[PDB]
Amino acid sequence: EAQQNDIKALRRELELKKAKLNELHEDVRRKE
Amino acid sequence: MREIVHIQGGQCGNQIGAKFWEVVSDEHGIDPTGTYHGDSDLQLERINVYFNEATGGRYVPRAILMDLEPGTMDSVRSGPYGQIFRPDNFVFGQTGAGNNWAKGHYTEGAELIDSVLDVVRKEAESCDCLQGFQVCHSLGGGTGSGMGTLLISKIREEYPDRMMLTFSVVPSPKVSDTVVEPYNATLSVHQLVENADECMVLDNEALYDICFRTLKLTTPTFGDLNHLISAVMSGITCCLRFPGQLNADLRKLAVNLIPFPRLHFFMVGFTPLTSRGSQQYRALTVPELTQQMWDAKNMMCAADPRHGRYLTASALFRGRMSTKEVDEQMLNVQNKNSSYFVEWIPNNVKSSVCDIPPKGLKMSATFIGNSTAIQEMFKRVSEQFTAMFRRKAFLHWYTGEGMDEMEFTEAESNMNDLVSEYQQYQ
Amino acid sequence: MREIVHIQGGQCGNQIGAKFWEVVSDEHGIDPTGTYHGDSDLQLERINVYFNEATGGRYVPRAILMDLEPGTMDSVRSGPYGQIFRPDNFVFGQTGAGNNWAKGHYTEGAELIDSVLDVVRKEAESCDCLQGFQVCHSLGGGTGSGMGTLLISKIREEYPDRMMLTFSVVPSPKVSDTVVEPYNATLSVHQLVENADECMVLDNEALYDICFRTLKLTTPTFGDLNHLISAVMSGITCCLRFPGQLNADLRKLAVNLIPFPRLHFFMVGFTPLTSRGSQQYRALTVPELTQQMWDAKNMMCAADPRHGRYLTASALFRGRMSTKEVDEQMLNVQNKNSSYFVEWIPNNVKSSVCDIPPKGLKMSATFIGNSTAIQEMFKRVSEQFTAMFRRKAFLHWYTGEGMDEMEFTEAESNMNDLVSEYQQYQ
Amino acid sequence: REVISIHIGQAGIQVGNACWELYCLEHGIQPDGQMPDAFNTFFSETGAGKHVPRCIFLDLEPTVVDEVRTGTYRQLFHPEQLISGKEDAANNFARGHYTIGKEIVDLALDRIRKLADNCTGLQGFLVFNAVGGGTGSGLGSLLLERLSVDYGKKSKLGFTVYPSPQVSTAVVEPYNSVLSTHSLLEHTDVAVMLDNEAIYDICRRSLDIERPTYTNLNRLIAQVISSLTASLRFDGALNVDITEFQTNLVPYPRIHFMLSSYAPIISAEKAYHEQLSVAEITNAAFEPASMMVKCDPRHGKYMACCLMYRGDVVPKDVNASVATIKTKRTIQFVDWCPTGFKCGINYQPPTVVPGGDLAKVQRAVCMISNSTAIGEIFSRLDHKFDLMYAKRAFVHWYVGEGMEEGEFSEAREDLAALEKDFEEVGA
Amino acid sequence: REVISIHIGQAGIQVGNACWELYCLEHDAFNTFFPRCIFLDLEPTVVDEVRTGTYRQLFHPEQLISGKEDAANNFARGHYTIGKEIVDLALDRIRKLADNCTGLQGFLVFNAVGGGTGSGLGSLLLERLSVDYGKKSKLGFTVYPSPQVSTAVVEPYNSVLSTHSLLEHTDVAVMLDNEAIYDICRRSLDIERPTYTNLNRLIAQVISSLTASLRFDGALNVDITEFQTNLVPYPRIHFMLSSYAPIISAEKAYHEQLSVAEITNAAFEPASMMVKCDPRHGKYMACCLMYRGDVVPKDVNASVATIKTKRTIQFVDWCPTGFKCGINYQPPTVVPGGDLAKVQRAVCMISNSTAIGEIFSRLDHKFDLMYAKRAFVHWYVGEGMEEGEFSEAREDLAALEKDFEEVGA
Ligand SMILES: Nc1nc2c(ncn2[C@@H]2O[C@H](COP(=O)(O)OP(=O)(O)OP(=O)(O)O)[C@@H](O)[C@H]2O)c(=O)[nH]1
Ligand SMILES: Nc1nc2c(ncn2[C@@H]2O[C@H](COP(=O)(O)OP(=O)(O)OP(=O)(O)O)[C@@H](O)[C@H]2O)c(=O)[nH]1
Ligand SMILES: Nc1nc2c(ncn2[C@@H]2O[C@H](COP(=O)(O)OP(=O)(O)O)[C@@H](O)[C@H]2O)c(=O)[nH]1
Ligand SMILES: Nc1nc2c(ncn2[C@@H]2O[C@H](COP(=O)(O)OP(=O)(O)O)[C@@H](O)[C@H]2O)c(=O)[nH]1
Ligand SMILES: [Mg+2]
């Protein structure tokens, strides 16, 4: 059960990081 | 002109097809007795794609029911839109496979597949310019999966140039009805990767989940789930039946969403889907349709697309709408969520607009994303398959029927090399 | 174009917001069904600020209800104008905090606030140009104070460049509904001074005083209190919805009334507010609105400003008025009582006029004064906080949830230096 | 010859609503834009019988612009002219000069270019703004900066509204006035001040209106502009142009601030019982009970004065009347200037608009003078601006927008230097 | 004198459905059009909308050609597999259309290169027309895919493979994007939500303005052979930016004072080009100005002088006389339900420059990225193609880029 919690935490962190990355990419496109 | 022959297999195929012919007959304005009673002119000129004029305005569907148990045939014949089929098209065995893929693929199929092929041939050459065949079946059952799969292989041997659609449901461990689901689904996919043209993957978890969350139904019987699947199938072949500002046939969608020949497993979604209590609290605009389309909690598969990347995507729109709004919305979702899309492919979204909405609605949409998140289920299945096959559970029920150990190893091999190629292209 | 998304938290927030949406919808001529039935074209020009057109005259309010117990949600859908809210905007927990700021800010908030954030995001991106957010809540309860304050902090780090109004009633010893009022108020104010752009102090004691003398009501239920608060909220944002000879928007008011980033606690009053027995004997001119505006017994807080000094003040006038009269009245009340005003700022009063009165009156006004006397509440609350915390009363319900002791000491220090810093500029 | 008129801010375009109202009612054009050649200075002709004004309304808040889009004159104004932003500067000079100004002034410029290109003998521009706000102050100064670098030699008549000494509506307006004048100093060629308390007192005493709104204020401002452009629009016995004021009234390239007045502002009843001639209106134009800026020229000394005369006026008595003023000793002129007057007479009387509170007068005088009493107002502004700046009140809003503490001190000493400049020319 | 028009594809015949509506509404002057047309497509859905539409009796039944099944956004399918059975029937009709004619100026073709029918059998029709007639002009007004606005996925493959034949087959090729036209309808026509119908209406305006010289007598007439000389300085550089003025609504038109000087200017700003490219990066090689309606030669003469003396735009060092004017007397007509107001005079400008060299370079990367990983190539190869023609079409556009850079210097 412990490893299951690790899975559902790492994906959520991974998801937040991917969303931040998209924001940065969008800003570069607008600024260029 | 362009022709679609319908083939339904097994209990799942028959009941899904029953609801399908209900909604298509209403769209073309045909009564349960078989005679035209519609109002608009538009509903007459494109009924040959699905019907045949017999005599005295009797339009009979171009369908083939196929199973091994009479309960499904009698339930079909009993209900409304049951007396519109030709009784000769109810090709029907007698013994029954019963969730044994070997029975439906080697023993019992061997005496039925001859009769179905006779009917489908006579029904195929009856029309002039065939567009393709349309099959609805399952991958957990025996007479649906095994016989339907064998029928797919024989058909692709005879007609190798014609198109082929397969609406197939796959089993998931959260909704697991039979015990031998992995043994069936793994072998069934082995044949689907080499025989079908494209497969629109379905599942019951997402369907039950959709009716809970978005539709907020209380008792979602199979009728409502089959109603949703039918609405998807009507949306995918609305371009042939009605004029639009931009048309996209079956072949047109296939070439724009399949970048490599073995990468033909899709996810499907339908919009708009709203609760009955909130149907009047909403607008009907293209941006609203797009927000509900690209929601990951709206696919009709239990595979979250945000767990991977989209290779391509498709949006078939129906209704009087401005094409500019269509392209701007597709471009907007292509720029803001840049990481979820593949990089060495710009323009991962093909779009199309038809001018006739489904009956009762103003504007609808159908989404077909070819993502690389679909590989989780194949891994989600293969881990179960190995769990049984490491220790030969239930294996003798198939071995004493003809399958040898090399067949299961081959099915694992094809499953494993497939999940690696999805992982490669992500 | 300029847009306000509305957020109601807790039981206090839900009744205040309920009577608020009735008052605005009645101003814009929208019936309980939610369809337009007004006459003037002017009422349609500025409905984008608070509503969205759905279909066929259906206007839905741009509000989000957020609480923890379903009694408030069902009481909202029961009453009139209850059928206008979109049912999806009823984001909602199930367990209940119950007058425990730690339960409202650490345990139940951590799983509800992602949901309320997602609704707010859709409501913010659904519109084009945000003017600000509008949050109504209390400071004594738990599901309003702790959760709402966490929502404020989360939103401010998301959209940092937009305004934000929060209307908060605060506890007082004479109206003491719960026992842990200071432990909730002191921690809530600590977060408000560092997050909110501007706050509008309210209290229930002054509202009861208004209903006794000015309204002369027999049975002042909560409906009338919410009626007064709603009239104030409509009065301040009237400038964005209607044109006038001198328009003053929310940001224009904020920069004109806040001299220093920590001095953003205002006391509010509204005129005319007269009993039905004396409403017949009255006249409607500018001087009679002012000398009822600037009366100390009309403020909606229990902080008498003549026990302090005025930094700045503002009046928002509604109705066809002469701007010369408006300015000379502000000049007269500032020249006579010069001691009550700050000395190193001349012309302490910002004034504006709008040309649309509320229905039922010919001329009205709305006063917003940023005095220094608001520190009476901070000392008045902090001593009760100290009286329990010196002896560790009720502490374990806060401590055993995740909070430690330095949180209370830091909160004490910040509230204490705040009342100290108000006193220095005094 | 043509002159285009630009309006910035809430007060700016409201003033324009009264001006173009007065213009069409003077030249006999209905609000829809068609007649039932002197209109060529302000209206360009489509060639299909439709006349369009040479003006651009622009501001940052869409409220005041869109009642104009739906009033009676929906069809008079070309749509592109009525520029409108999306959100207001909110009484914040920096916000109008750097944050929001930088997006909107470039659209105004590439508009105003084709207004000038349609013109042939462009006499100049004339701008309307109130310095108390953020739009009229911030992007107004920014617009004047870019106008000076574009044209330079063309006149820019600035009819500005300064904040009143005691009657005020905003609280950060001392900051806005000082920073705005810092650039209005070296850009506007001829800048006319129009206070608000002075106009309030005129409507209270002269027009005997005890309850005036902004409508009457804007009405009489349009009357002064009409009296000032009649010399350009129509022929008279002795006319002047807009390039005449550049030379004849400002002795030094930094002293350009004029006190305006107009006579006779008389209600409908006094005119019936009172007499109009040139001598008494020449008198009434000088008394401080009829000035448009709260200052007293009795405390100052005149450099040069200007006198617009409208209606049935012969030139012999304007000379005799100005002679009587010079022989009086209540007002005195600077030692360096022996002659201090610039006179002008035009044939057409001022027309009246229905609904206004101005009577139909046979003759009128519009006086525009330059003095040193204007130095007292600027000093009066410095006391209360410096009053709050030392403690750094309200500075955090402007510096949060992207400014610093440097521009306050450097703008402060520049206008402080101007105080010393005014005192040394008066000696 | 007559000129016949061919329409290919979903985009081609919808453009024609608006173009012919304008021709009938506009009308011995008719002799050049009255129709001398052919619609042809592989999908029968859009052609048979015409067969039952309002213009049932207007078109002779045979004219409306229609295949059996679509090429489905597949250049190879519409050029090798399915084209081979319908193209022969089409051109063996167009021949007898030309035999009906006596003084044929030329043909004009309408196609979009993104699709399979517009691109594939477009080029196939062009190749048999070039070997059959050779000398007669064939004006091709094509629709190239936009850089950022896009509806298909494999359209880079189609656009490159179509261009390789559009070079040496058509005589005068006018680019038209969809984003640029969308921007035009958004900016000038202030239509915030446009559809394909509005685009096709103003495309017809451009076509009508360049054939009105044949139809009606003007002060300075210009034939189709005139564009052949005056705008293409090299046999392989014929790609024209288009523009039109005044594109204006019904209310704004009355308010503004349309004249010759300002519309000659407005037809030169990049805010009014029919192709998404910035000619500020390029240098004008030649310009052509069709004036319709109320035009005296003086103000058009004065207007080209002001353009030459401006420095916001530059010309090549080769042409001091870098213009070709043309004046016709009859004003442009209007369609009920159309959005363009009636104007005394209008200008359709067709130029040639090096800004077009940017669109090909922009196109190259998108095609290059997909081709490197061999995306979608298996569809085209199984249709009948090979890897040879993909790589060789790639190097043809590479040569064209160097060509524009060399001539522009
Ligand atoms: N004389 C005169 N002054 C006016 C009128 N309307 C507004 N004002 C003045 O304008 C000043 C404030 O500026 P506004 O024009 O109202 O607002 P703004 O300049 O656009 O600046 P923002 O409020 O930030 O948009 C006030 O001090 C008024 O004195 C008017 O009708 N006549
Ligand atoms: N301007 C304009 N362009 C159109 C129109 N219809 C389609 N297009 C363009 O055509 C391109 C795709 O080709 P289509 O014409 O739709 O289809 P096709 O050329 O016949 O090829 P197939 O789909 O295989 O039949 C898209 O990129 C659109 O931009 C139209 O009505 N007007
Ligand atoms: N959506 C849907 N799924 C069905 C229906 N009937 C059966 N299934 C699914 O089919 C699977 C069993 O397939 P089965 O009916 O035994 O196939 P067959 O025996 O080969 O005909 C189960 O997982 C069910 O969830 C139906 O009416 N609708
Ligand atoms: N003005 C007003 N105040 C209310 C109303 N209902 C509750 N309150 C105030 O709410 C305070 C207690 O907060 P509570 O409702 O428990 O907040 P919550 O539990 O966080 O939602 C009391 O001091 C009341 O004065 C109402 O209808 N109107
Ligand atoms: Mg097509």
Residue numbers in the entry:
A (entry chain X1): 119 to 150
B (entry chain B5), C (entry chain A5): 1 to 426
D (entry chain A4): 2 to 37, 47 to 437
E (entry chain B4): 2 to 28, 47 to 53, 63 to 437
Question: What do the paper's sentences say?
Answer:
Dyneins are a eukaryotic family of ATP-dependent microtubule motor. They are categorized by their two major roles inside cells; cytoplasmic dyneins travel along microtubules and are responsible for both intracellular and intraflagellar transport, whereas axonemal dyneins are docked onto doublet microtubules inside cilia and power ciliary beating. The ODA has a single large dynein motor that repeats every 24 nm and influences the frequency of ciliary waveforms. Here, we report a single-particle cryo-EM reconstruction of three-headed axonemal dynein natively bound to doublet microtubules.
In Chlamydomonas, the ODA-DC is a heterotrimer made of a coiled-coil of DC1 and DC2 and a calcium-binding subunit, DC319,20. Our previous structure of a doublet microtubule revealed that the N-terminal half of the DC1/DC2 coiled-coil occupies the external cleft between protofilaments A07 and A0820. In the ODA-bound state, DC3 sits midway along the microtubule-bound portion of the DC1/2 coiled-coil and interacts exclusively with helical bundle 3 of the γ-HC. The C-terminal halves of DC1/2 are also resolved and elevate from the surface of the doublet microtubule to interact with the neighboring proximal ODA. They bisect the tails of β-HC and γ-HC, making contacts with both, and span as far as the ICs, explaining the ability of both ICs to form chemical crosslinks with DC1 and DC240. Thus, the tails of β- and γ-HC are required for the attachment of axonemal dyneins to doublet microtubules. The ODA is tethered to doublet microtubules almost exclusively through the ODA-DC, explaining why mutations in ODA-DC subunits are associated with decreased levels or complete loss of ODA complexes from doublet microtubules.
